[PDB]
Amino acid sequence: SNAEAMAALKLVPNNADFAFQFFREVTQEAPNKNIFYSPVSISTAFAMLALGARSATQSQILEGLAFNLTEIQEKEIHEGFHNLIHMLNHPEGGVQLNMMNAIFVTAALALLRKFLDDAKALYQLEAFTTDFNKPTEAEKQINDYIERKTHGKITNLVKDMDPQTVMLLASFVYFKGSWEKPFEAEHTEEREFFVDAETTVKVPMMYQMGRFDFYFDEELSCTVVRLHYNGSATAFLVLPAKGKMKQLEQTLDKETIQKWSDHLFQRFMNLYFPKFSISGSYEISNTLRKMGIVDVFTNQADLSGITGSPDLKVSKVVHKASLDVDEKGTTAVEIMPISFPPTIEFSHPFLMLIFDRDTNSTLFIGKIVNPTI
Numbered sequence: 001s002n003a004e005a006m007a008a009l010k011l012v013p014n015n016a017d018f019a020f021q022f023f024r025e026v027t028q029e030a031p032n033k034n035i036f037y038s039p040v041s042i043s044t045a046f047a048m049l050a051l052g053a054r055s056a057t058q059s060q061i062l063e064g065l066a067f068n069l070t071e072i073q074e075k076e077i078h079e080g081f082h083n084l085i086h087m088l089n090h091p092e093g094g095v096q097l098n099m100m101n102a103i104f105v106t107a108a109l110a111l112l113r114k115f116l117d118d119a120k121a122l123y124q125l126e127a128f129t130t131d132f133n134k135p136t137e138a139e140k141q142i143n144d145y146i147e148r149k150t151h152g153k154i155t156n157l158v159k160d161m162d163p164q165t166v167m168l169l170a171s172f173v174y175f176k177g178s179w180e181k182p183f184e185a186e187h188t189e190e191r192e193f194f195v196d197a198e199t200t201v202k203v204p205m206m207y208q209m210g211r212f213d214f215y216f217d218e219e220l221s222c223t224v225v226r227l228h229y230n231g232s233a234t235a236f237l238v239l240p241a242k243g244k245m246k247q248l249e250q251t252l253d254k255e256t257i258q259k260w261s262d263h264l265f266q267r268f269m270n271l272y273f274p275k276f277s278i279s280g281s282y283e284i285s286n287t288l289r290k291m292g293i294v295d296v297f298t299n300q301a302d303l304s305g306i307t308g309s310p311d312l313k314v315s316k317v318v319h320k321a322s323l324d325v326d327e328k329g330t331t332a333v334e335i336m337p338i339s340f341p342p343t344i345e346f347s348h349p350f351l352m353l354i355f356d357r358d359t360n361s362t363l364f365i366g367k368i369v370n371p372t373i
């Protein structure tokens, strides 16, 4: 839904499929914890490796990313992702996501100019020769890099790095949206959030009254509220009924998303939503292995497009996503609402799904069980 987004849009179902398989996988390996990551950022970091991959290494990357090579060209995927990053990262554009990919490669290996140029042009890759036999100084320099790159918002990407690391793939992304409809800060008050409930925490609960996109599904036992950001990003806030999270996790896919957005309608309501911040920080190898991306991690990797020899493999891929949510920030037609409008209060665990409306991509997937962690 942006026309400049032509190449990016060809990617829309494949990226959404990947986004939600990844989600299904990760909620299994960690069933009662905060989950927070950037699908678009993971998809983008891996497609970028595909630039340098050959044969079955390459085919597994692209397929595990949910592309079917018999129906889409490799040219189009890279064109797609270049168009996507360009739109998400562009200053004049609707998101300013500032999502970043970096590789840290052992000084003991060669790099091809062809890979460095292709990956810079397409994917804005920064690549660093790294002496992993100085773990202390490697760690400190990598974390300083993430810190400086994120204007302070993300620090401590890596800790205790194997001195035999061949290549670290880093993707990281910080976001704070500006709300199309701001919450009034005078009315934020600490209220109770029900984690367990053997557990209960106090959270600053924001408040706003007004017309918001809303939908209830009975099938899933979920209240859906959708809030726009200024620009083109939008947030779906999904409140499952007590006892219905496991079920929502196991079903959630892009068809569920399309159902929701097809059926949202503006409803006047009292909205209570926590002011909070969340990080997710993962080494994502297993998850991707389980999704069928195998050889890239093993000695059977063909990354010869990177080094010019079949000597490279991905030792470690760290993904860190970070988000702040608060009240901020910035007429002639106003509804005459019913006497006792509904109240929706996100005060028990919920999903937060952040998308771009210009490229129809999933920017963030959050499962918030405890907004004070």
Ligand SMILES: C[C@]12CCC(=O)C=C1CC[C@@H]1[C@@H]2[C@@H](O)C[C@@]2(C)[C@H]1CC[C@]2(O)C(=O)CO
Pocket: 001, 012, 013, 014, 016, 234, 254, 255, 257, 258, 259, 261, 355, 356, 357, 360, 361, 362
């Ligand atoms: C699932 C969906 C439609 C089917 C598909 O294969 C890919 C997606 C993922 C992104 C979704 C999209 C549509 O639903 C419209 C959405 C929600 C979009 C993100 C932003 C969006 O354009 C809107 O929020 C407009 O309401």
Ligand SMILES: NC[C@H]1O[C@H](O)[C@H](N)[C@@H](O)[C@@H]1O
Pocket: 050, 051, 052, 074, 075, 078, 079, 118
């Ligand atoms: N198949 C074409 C596509 O993939 C290659 O690996 C090239 N290096 C890149 O520039 C191009 O867009």
